[PDB]
């Protein structure tokens, strides 16, 4: 499982960007689907961004969780709904209106996936 969290620059978080990833890894491990050391997360801040066509100042947050395939839609819907409740409780605000938080769960292919331990 790879979790890429992409926040804008004007987004004010209640915690550090490092303590947000510790809460997101505990909420992924508590689903009982992944191993402990196989949950890998990263946080990316964006410098140049636009939302919409209007001139109002906005901010957003987006996570893309990539898991290996072979899990039913009840497991993938629970993983997106467990992560979206973690990110939404970390946003203090940004911009001139509400922050949009969204989480995508996508499936990597299991047959062509290579993995090694150096």
């Amino acid at each position: 499982p790879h979790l890429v969290i992409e926040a804008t620059a004007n987004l004010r978080l209640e915690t550090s960007p490092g303590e947000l990833l510790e809460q997101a890894n505990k909420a992924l491990f508590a689903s009982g689907q992944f191993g402990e050391a196989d949950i890998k997360s990263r946080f990316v801040t964006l410098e140049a961004y636009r939302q919409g066509t209007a001139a109002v100042e906005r901010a957003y947050l987006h996570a893309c969780l990539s898991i290996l395939d072979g899990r039913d839609i009840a497991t993938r819907t629970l993983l997106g709904a467990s992560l979206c409740a973690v990110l939404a409780e970390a946003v203090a605000g940004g911009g001139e209106e509400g922050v949009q938080v969204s989480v995508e769960v996508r499936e990597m292919e299991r047959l062509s996936y290579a993995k090694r331990v150096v």
Binding site: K26, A27, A30, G32, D72, I73, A74, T75, T77, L78, A81, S82, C84, A85
Partner: protein, 168 residues
């Protein structure tokens, strides 16, 4: 009126009757949790029986289950393959977990043909991980009642706990 719709409503009506039977053996805190789960299964049955034309549960409800699961996962120290039903009270909640796994397989057939109830099947999956953790708490506070009875110097009050399934 379709065939996977009446099977999914029949098992969700079966699950909320087993929870109503098992909420009389638990204490006053867990009875308030199980009575709010029974209201949420009633909201799922209205959504599935109308094929999505009535609104179902919100995502606020799944955020309430997972905030309970993260609370009880700290008390439950995980162990090996333990048999279901240590005490009589935790044996009733291990039955309701296996109805919620059967109700999840019926709702997953409604999702794979009609495209509805994907947020409902994510509730029954988080429910059966709470009923597993709720059953393992009752075995613990029954077992922590044994260590206080060993230190109290009781002869009859320690063995009535062991006759109810308290772990040694």
């Amino acid at each position: 009126k379709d065939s996977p719709i009446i099977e999914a409503n029949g098992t969700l009506d079966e699950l909320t009757s087993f929870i109503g039977e098992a909420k009389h053996y638990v204490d006053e805190e867990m009875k308030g949790i199980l009575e709010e789960i029974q209201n949420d299964i009633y909201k799922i049955m209205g959504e599935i029986g109308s094929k999505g034309k009535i609104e179902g549960i919100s995502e606020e409800r799944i955020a309430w289950l997972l905030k309970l699961i993260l609370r009880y996962m700290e008390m439950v120290n995980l162990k090996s393959f333990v048999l279901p039903g240590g005490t009589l009270e935790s044996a009733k909640l291990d039955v309701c977990r296996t109805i919620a796994r059967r109700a999840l397989r019926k709702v997953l057939t409604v999702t794979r043909e009609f495209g509805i109830g994907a947020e409902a099947a994510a509730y029954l999956l988080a429910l059966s991980d709470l009923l597993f953790l709720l059953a393992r708490v009752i075995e613990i506070e029954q077992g922590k009642k044994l260590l206080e009875a060993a230190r109290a110097g009781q002869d009859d009050e320690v063995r009535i706990l062991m006759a109810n399934g308290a772990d040694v």
